[PDB]
Amino acid sequence: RRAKKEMVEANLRLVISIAKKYTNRGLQFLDLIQEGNIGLMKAVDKFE
DNA sequence: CCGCTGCCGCGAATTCCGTTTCAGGGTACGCCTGATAATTTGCATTTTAAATACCATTTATTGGTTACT
């Protein structure tokens, strides 16, 4: 657990970029960001 | 050491009328699978050419002849 936190906290900027590419008047910025963070947690789980 | 500044809140008439019910974000794709929404038959209740089984009180035919143009 304490290992995965490090990658998750490292790649938040990546999430920000991908999200802002979709922000143009959808839900709201922060909702997109948080949903992307869910996705990032999934990806960290699946990466080899 | 009990004075003054600067923030932030809050408020600003009445009815009708009119009118365009109206638009704008800029991001993928192909699998299995269950999950409903469609579509297919039979059985209860009417309704059955009518057919049927009894009570009923009210004309009909009636029983005709005895008087008589």
PDB file of N, CA and C in Angstrom, chain A residues 20-45:
ATOM      1  N   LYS A  20      -8.059  18.154 -18.295  1.00  0.00           N
ATOM      2  CA  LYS A  20      -8.320  19.467 -18.870  1.00  0.00           C
ATOM      3  C   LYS A  20      -8.540  19.371 -20.361  1.00  0.00           C
ATOM      4  N   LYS A  21      -8.049  18.308 -20.986  1.00  0.00           N
ATOM      5  CA  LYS A  21      -8.407  18.128 -22.387  1.00  0.00           C
ATOM      6  C   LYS A  21      -9.897  17.863 -22.592  1.00  0.00           C
ATOM      7  N   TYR A  22     -10.631  17.484 -21.544  1.00  0.00           N
ATOM      8  CA  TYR A  22     -12.051  17.162 -21.641  1.00  0.00           C
ATOM      9  C   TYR A  22     -12.939  18.172 -20.934  1.00  0.00           C
ATOM     10  N   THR A  23     -12.363  19.202 -20.326  1.00  0.00           N
ATOM     11  CA  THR A  23     -13.086  20.046 -19.389  1.00  0.00           C
ATOM     12  C   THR A  23     -14.050  20.976 -20.062  1.00  0.00           C
ATOM     13  N   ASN A  24     -14.057  21.016 -21.381  1.00  0.00           N
ATOM     14  CA  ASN A  24     -14.744  22.103 -22.052  1.00  0.00           C
ATOM     15  C   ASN A  24     -16.234  21.951 -21.811  1.00  0.00           C
ATOM     16  N   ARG A  25     -16.701  22.451 -20.672  1.00  0.00           N
ATOM     17  CA  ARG A  25     -18.126  22.542 -20.405  1.00  0.00           C
ATOM     18  C   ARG A  25     -18.789  21.167 -20.370  1.00  0.00           C
ATOM     19  N   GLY A  26     -18.370  20.312 -19.438  1.00  0.00           N
ATOM     20  CA  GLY A  26     -18.974  19.002 -19.252  1.00  0.00           C
ATOM     21  C   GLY A  26     -19.683  18.786 -17.930  1.00  0.00           C
ATOM     22  N   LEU A  27     -18.990  18.180 -16.962  1.00  0.00           N
ATOM     23  CA  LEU A  27     -19.494  18.105 -15.599  1.00  0.00           C
ATOM     24  C   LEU A  27     -19.013  19.298 -14.790  1.00  0.00           C
ATOM     25  N   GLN A  28     -17.711  19.346 -14.521  1.00  0.00           N
ATOM     26  CA  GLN A  28     -16.942  20.414 -13.889  1.00  0.00           C
ATOM     27  C   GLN A  28     -15.508  19.928 -13.822  1.00  0.00           C
ATOM     28  N   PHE A  29     -14.554  20.827 -13.612  1.00  0.00           N
ATOM     29  CA  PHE A  29     -13.159  20.410 -13.620  1.00  0.00           C
ATOM     30  C   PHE A  29     -12.885  19.350 -12.567  1.00  0.00           C
ATOM     31  N   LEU A  30     -13.304  19.604 -11.336  1.00  0.00           N
ATOM     32  CA  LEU A  30     -12.860  18.765 -10.233  1.00  0.00           C
ATOM     33  C   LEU A  30     -13.470  17.375 -10.306  1.00  0.00           C
ATOM     34  N   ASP A  31     -14.702  17.267 -10.792  1.00  0.00           N
ATOM     35  CA  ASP A  31     -15.293  15.945 -10.946  1.00  0.00           C
ATOM     36  C   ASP A  31     -14.498  15.113 -11.939  1.00  0.00           C
ATOM     37  N   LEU A  32     -14.122  15.722 -13.060  1.00  0.00           N
ATOM     38  CA  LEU A  32     -13.302  15.018 -14.030  1.00  0.00           C
ATOM     39  C   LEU A  32     -11.984  14.598 -13.414  1.00  0.00           C
ATOM     40  N   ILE A  33     -11.361  15.489 -12.649  1.00  0.00           N
ATOM     41  CA  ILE A  33     -10.075  15.168 -12.046  1.00  0.00           C
ATOM     42  C   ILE A  33     -10.204  13.974 -11.117  1.00  0.00           C
ATOM     43  N   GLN A  34     -11.234  13.964 -10.278  1.00  0.00           N
ATOM     44  CA  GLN A  34     -11.368  12.884  -9.310  1.00  0.00           C
ATOM     45  C   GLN A  34     -11.649  11.561 -10.002  1.00  0.00           C
ATOM     46  N   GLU A  35     -12.483  11.590 -11.036  1.00  0.00           N
ATOM     47  CA  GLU A  35     -12.748  10.358 -11.759  1.00  0.00           C
ATOM     48  C   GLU A  35     -11.483   9.841 -12.429  1.00  0.00           C
ATOM     49  N   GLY A  36     -10.689  10.747 -12.990  1.00  0.00           N
ATOM     50  CA  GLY A  36      -9.409  10.346 -13.531  1.00  0.00           C
ATOM     51  C   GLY A  36      -8.506   9.741 -12.478  1.00  0.00           C
ATOM     52  N   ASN A  37      -8.563  10.256 -11.253  1.00  0.00           N
ATOM     53  CA  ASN A  37      -7.740   9.682 -10.195  1.00  0.00           C
ATOM     54  C   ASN A  37      -8.155   8.251  -9.898  1.00  0.00           C
ATOM     55  N   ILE A  38      -9.458   7.978  -9.931  1.00  0.00           N
ATOM     56  CA  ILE A  38      -9.907   6.588  -9.839  1.00  0.00           C
ATOM     57  C   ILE A  38      -9.254   5.754 -10.930  1.00  0.00           C
ATOM     58  N   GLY A  39      -9.282   6.261 -12.157  1.00  0.00           N
ATOM     59  CA  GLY A  39      -8.660   5.529 -13.249  1.00  0.00           C
ATOM     60  C   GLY A  39      -7.178   5.297 -13.026  1.00  0.00           C
ATOM     61  N   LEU A  40      -6.487   6.301 -12.497  1.00  0.00           N
ATOM     62  CA  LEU A  40      -5.058   6.186 -12.245  1.00  0.00           C
ATOM     63  C   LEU A  40      -4.769   5.106 -11.223  1.00  0.00           C
ATOM     64  N   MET A  41      -5.587   5.033 -10.180  1.00  0.00           N
ATOM     65  CA  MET A  41      -5.408   3.978  -9.191  1.00  0.00           C
ATOM     66  C   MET A  41      -5.554   2.614  -9.846  1.00  0.00           C
ATOM     67  N   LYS A  42      -6.556   2.477 -10.712  1.00  0.00           N
ATOM     68  CA  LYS A  42      -6.705   1.228 -11.454  1.00  0.00           C
ATOM     69  C   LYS A  42      -5.452   0.911 -12.264  1.00  0.00           C
ATOM     70  N   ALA A  43      -4.944   1.905 -12.989  1.00  0.00           N
ATOM     71  CA  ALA A  43      -3.800   1.672 -13.864  1.00  0.00           C
ATOM     72  C   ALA A  43      -2.576   1.257 -13.065  1.00  0.00           C
ATOM     73  N   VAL A  44      -2.338   1.914 -11.932  1.00  0.00           N
ATOM     74  CA  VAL A  44      -1.220   1.527 -11.079  1.00  0.00           C
ATOM     75  C   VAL A  44      -1.383   0.089 -10.634  1.00  0.00           C
ATOM     76  N   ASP A  45      -2.619  -0.327 -10.385  1.00  0.00           N
ATOM     77  CA  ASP A  45      -2.816  -1.729 -10.050  1.00  0.00           C
ATOM     78  C   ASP A  45      -2.394  -2.631 -11.207  1.00  0.00           C
TER      79      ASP A  45
END
